Amino acid sequence: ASGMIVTDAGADQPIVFVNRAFSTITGYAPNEVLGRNARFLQGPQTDAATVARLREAIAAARPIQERILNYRKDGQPFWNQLSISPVRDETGNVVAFVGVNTDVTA
Amino acid sequence: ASGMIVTDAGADQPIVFVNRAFSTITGYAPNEVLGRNARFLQGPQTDAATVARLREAIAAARPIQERILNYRKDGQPFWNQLSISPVRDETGNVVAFVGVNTD
Numbered sequence: 001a002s003g004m005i006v007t008d009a010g011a012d013q014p015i016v017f018v019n020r021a022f023s024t025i026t027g028y029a030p031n032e033v034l035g036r037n038a039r040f041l042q043g044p045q046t047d048a049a050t051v052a053r054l055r056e057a058i059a060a061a062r063p064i065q066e067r068i069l070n071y072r073k074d075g076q077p078f079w080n081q082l083s084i085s086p087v088r089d090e091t092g093n094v095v096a097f098v099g100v101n102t103d104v105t106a
Numbered sequence: 107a108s109g110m111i112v113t114d115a116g117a118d119q120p121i122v123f124v125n126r127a128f129s130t131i132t133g134y135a136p137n138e139v140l141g142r143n144a145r146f147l148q149g150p151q152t153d154a155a156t157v158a159r160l161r162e163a164i165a166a167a168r169p170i171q172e173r174i175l176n177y178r179k180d181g182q183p184f185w186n187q188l189s190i191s192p193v194r195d196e197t198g199n200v201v202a203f204v205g206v207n208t209d
């Protein structure tokens with residue numbers, strides 16, 4: 001169904017966990033993405049304005065939803081319905097980010 | 107630093123990921139918690155009414171916070187400042203649960 005990406009909150013948000021659906025959608029195994037920023041999913045037809053909105057939202061730890069053009073490991077484009085939210089503790093500290101991916105290419 | 111627990115949405119919400127602080131707080135390594143329901147952290151003096159509120163919130167995929175008595179691997183009791191929220195896709199399907207153990 002829907003992919004899930006968990007990243008660290010700091011140091012440019014390296015991936016720390018992906019679910020099985022993430023591999024189904026993107027063609028990447030966990031081994032191939034752990035420790036990397038998720039921006040490797042982008043490529044030349046990705047909308048720069050959309051990437052800028054993601055960058056500013058993540059810097060502010062503000063939830064954001066975007067439809068963004070991404071690329072499978074072998075280079076096949078797909079439309080990623082992407083929702084990112086910070087994970088906060090009760091003091092308001094950001095512990096992680098969680099991203100949900102749906103392939104909406106259909 | 108605050109602990110984080112990620113579980114699957116269905117079956118019995120098995121743990122699929124914990125952060126470093128989870129191990130600092132609880133004394134459990136990832137290998138000894140992955141695939142288990144987090145209820146193993148509970149013990150003799152855990153408040154049953156608190157557990158029942160968590161049970162109903164998870165069943166309905168509702169956000170909840172509880173201060174719950176838990177036990178470290180070595181059996182020492184500690185107060186877990188626990189907050190749980192569902193992770194949803196845009197069609198409203200629950201993909202996972204995320205728990206935070208606030209430091």
Ligand SMILES: Cc1cc2nc3c(=O)[nH]c(=O)nc-3n(C[C@H](O)[C@H](O)[C@H](O)COP(=O)(O)O)c2cc1C
Binds near residue numbers: 038042054058
């Ligand atoms: C939890 C999380 C999941 C993300 N998932 C994706 C994704 O699936 N596709 C994507 O293009 N970018 C994703 N990103 C965004 C990139 O990692 C990055 O934040 C974005 O490209 C903007 O920053 P940049 O301009 O430094 O690349 C995700 C970010 C986070 C924090």
Ligand SMILES: Cc1cc2nc3c(=O)[nH]c(=O)nc-3n(C[C@H](O)[C@H](O)[C@H](O)COP(=O)(O)O)c2cc1C
Binds near residue numbers: 113205
């Ligand atoms: C993501 C997540 C994290 C959880 N973390 C804890 C925890 O740290 N301590 C705890 O006692 N219960 C925790 N729980 C709750 C138990 O897993 C379980 O839902 C609760 O005991 C109520 O269900 P039960 O009556 O079937 O045990 C967590 C649940 C979820 C979904």
